[PDB]
Each structure stands twice: as structure tokens, then as C-alpha cells.
Amino acid sequence: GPHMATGQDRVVALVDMDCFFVQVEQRQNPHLRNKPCAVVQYKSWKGGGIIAVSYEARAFGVTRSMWADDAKKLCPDLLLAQVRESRGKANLTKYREASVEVMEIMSRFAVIERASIDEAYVDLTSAVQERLQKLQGQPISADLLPSTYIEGLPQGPTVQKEGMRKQGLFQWLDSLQIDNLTSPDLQLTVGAVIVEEMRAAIERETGFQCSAGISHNKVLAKLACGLNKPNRQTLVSHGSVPQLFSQMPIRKIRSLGGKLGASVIEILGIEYMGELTQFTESQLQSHFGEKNGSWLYAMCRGIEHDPVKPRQLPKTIGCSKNFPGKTALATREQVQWWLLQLAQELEERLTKDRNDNDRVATQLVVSIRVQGDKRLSSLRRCCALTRYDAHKMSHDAFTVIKNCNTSGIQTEWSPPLTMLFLCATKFSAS
DNA sequence: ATTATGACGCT
DNA sequence: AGCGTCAT
Ligand SMILES: Nc1nc2c(ncn2[C@H]2C[C@H](O)[C@@H](COP(=O)(O)NP(=O)(O)OP(=O)(O)O)O2)c(=O)[nH]1
Ligand SMILES: [Mg+2]
Ligand SMILES: [Mg+2]
Predict the structure, then answer these.
(1) Is A99 exposed, middle or buried (0-12, 13-18, 19+ CB in 10 A)?
(2) Residue with CA nearest C1' of nucleotide B3
(3) Domain coordinates of chain A in residue numbers?
């Protein structure tokens, strides 16, 4: 009743750049704009692997993870841009720099948490209180929400999508009590106004379009963001959760798309998020552990407490390359050469990070994969990172991994290596 | 032969 | 510390 917390204390948004790497390449090359196009890394093997797809190309069935040659079968006029190659490997610097452009604009409006190269959570609670004081009980005009969808509306008592959007928004605004400065629905609405402004600023100052979700926590904001892509934003209210979750496959919720979600489905014999409400918190904890069980009990009611961490910069800076099938490294000279290439890229990125961000990494993590292992990492070993020197870093990585070489011979490497990975971690202010 | 990252939980 | 899971 009156003591049952409803998880409506915060306003949280999730901003995700639409087909990011594609947009970066389309800004640079106008010939790619408003076309089916995709971004690929490498080229020789099956045309390269697609990692980003414009919405025009998605209409033909092109997806991430698809080989470019296969995508061309679905979409013969697909345009391709290739990721830059440096020191023998894909180099993603152009997209990281574009990411920084966007994140610095977002940070003008509120403290953000960088969740990926192209997505950030925003805690808008305080900004919303400020705007509410400025409004002075003035209603919110639909004109201030020109790209906003209200999930679940319209309902009750009509052909085109923009008309649908406007009907739902009008129903939402008509039911708003702008008198009450602590109304959660009002707070979400003002949050949506602020996100319209943030998205307008991003597009004006970078050329990039994005989608966004506005709700009371990170998981609902993330789910909301996906409901109306591209170039739109969606408000998911607390009240919309029962209907939304009643047909929502468990795997759609961030963190339940893998083994844990499969176990929820299999153990409980359910399919949809909403079905979780019928279990007690102790029941869920008994199946899935204390932490997961409490999290699921709250999440299926729309409640989640994970804070938006004030963290605009990545916590690690890493370099990795796969050596699949027959390209695997089977000589010591090979392993040393590729460790050096990875370490030279890492040195370049670390030196730029130190100059930009007043910090220094102190730990080097070396990960390898050996032929035959189905795991991402076969071995992970750390050593000290005391100088930004590529030859030192590559020598240190070789020292920590050299005992994996089964070959009695000194020149050969067996079993051959199918992945190398260097990661700088444990930053300190400098 | 998807690949290149990056975050975080467990023990 | 090293490994696994979840992303994508
Ligand atoms: N190197 C690499 N980059 C990747 C990979 N997957 C994605 N990227 C890169 C390329 C992506 O552009 C970027 C952002 O990832 P998303 O937000 O998941 N996809 P997007 O923004 O394209 O589409 P949407 O409109 O649905 O949000 O990360 C990968 O496996 N490897
Ligand atoms: Mg995106
Ligand atoms: Mg993203």
C-alpha cells in the first residue's frame, strides 16, 4: 500500500547513436548518405565482416555479423565503408574520437555514464526539478516533444505512424497533472523535454542522429530506447510496465539474454517478463541466487536501483586481434611481431589518453587463445605497466605468456595462437 | 573464419 | 588475481 516503494524516484535516460559507425562514415563521405550501406572490417575473407548497418540496408535483411559477400546477395547495391587498418589490424580511432564529440555534448546537460562507444545513461532527476521550477505550473506543449512516443498510447477510442505518435502524445499530455511538482509522470515528461533538447544539440553540432529512452531506471530506459528507432525517443512510464512486460520475452531485458535468462525460462516454465510477478522474492533467490533473485523480483515490477555512474571515460584501453584457422601464429618471431604491433597501438592510445585525461594506467593484462579452445580467453595474466613504451610492454607480455608454448623447440609455437589481447587497466590520476 | 572491444560478477 | 558472463 502506502509503504510499497514504486521505483519512481529518479528520471533516467539512455541515449544511443543510430547505426553509429555508418553515420560516422556517412558524415565523412556524402555519397553514402541516405543509402543502404554498412561498415566492414577487413576484406579478403568473404568480403569482410559487417559490424554496422544503415536502416535502408536493414530493410533488405543486412545485419551485423554477416559477411559482406552474403550481404551483397541480399542487397546488390549495398555500399560499404571499411574500418581503417594500421599495423596490420583494424583501428577504431575515428569512431572513438566521434564518440568523444557526442559524449562531451551530452555532459553539458547532465552527468553521464558511458555504457559503450555510442551509448550513455543520463541521470536527469535534478535537471528535471530545475526545469519544473522554471515552468511554474505551466503545462507542457506537444510542440516541445516533436519526436517523442509514449509507450502504450494511444489506447481506447489513425492510419499513418506520425498520426499515431501524436494521438498517443495528446492522450498522455491530457492526463497530466501539472499542478503536482512531485508527480512521477510529470517528471518523466519534463525529462523527455530535456532529452529532445540534448538530441537536438547532438544533431546540430555533430550531424549525428540518435534514439533515446526516458524512464525511471537504466533497464527501462534502455528498453524504451529500442521501441522506436531510428531518430526517435520513447517515454516508458511506471504505469506502462504491466502491459509492456506481459508479452515481453525475458531475453529482451539487459542481462537476461544469455544463460541466466535461459535458466529462468527453463526452471520456472515461463516465457515473458510479466510472469515473474507470481513468484516470491525468496523463490527467485532460491533459484537464481540472492542478488539475481532480488533483482528479478524488483525488475519484473519495473523497479531497478543501479545508479548512473559518473563516468564519461572508459575504464580500460585495450588492443586485440584474432588469428583464425590457418593464420594462427606458430613461430616465436610471429608472436613477438604481433605483440609488438598491438603494443604500439596501445602506446599511441595510452599517450593520447594521458594527455587528454590526466591519468596513467598501472596494470597490463595479457590474454591469449590457443587453437582448439572454444573460450574467448584461454589465459589471462597481469604484469606491471610502469612506462608507456611499446617494446617494453610487448617484451613483458611475451614474458608472462611464454610458458604456454608446449613446443620443446625454441623457434616454434605450439599450439598456435588464435588470439592476442593487451589491455591497460587500473588508472591513477597524473 | 564473425571481430574488436568493454563492463562487471564470482571465487 | 584469474576466470566466466553478457554485451555487440
Ligand atoms: N569492432 C566491433 N565493433 C562493433 C561490433 N558490434 C558493434 N560495433 C560497433 C559498430 C556500431 O556502429 C557501434 C555501436 O554499436 P550498436 O549500438 O550495438 N549498433 P549501431 O549503433 O550500429 O545500431 P543501432 O542503430 O541499432 O544502435 O559499435 C563488433 O562486434 N565489433
Ligand atoms: Mg547505437
Ligand atoms: Mg550502443
Answers:
(1) buried
(2) A322
(3) 1-18+89-249, 19-88, 250-307, 308-430
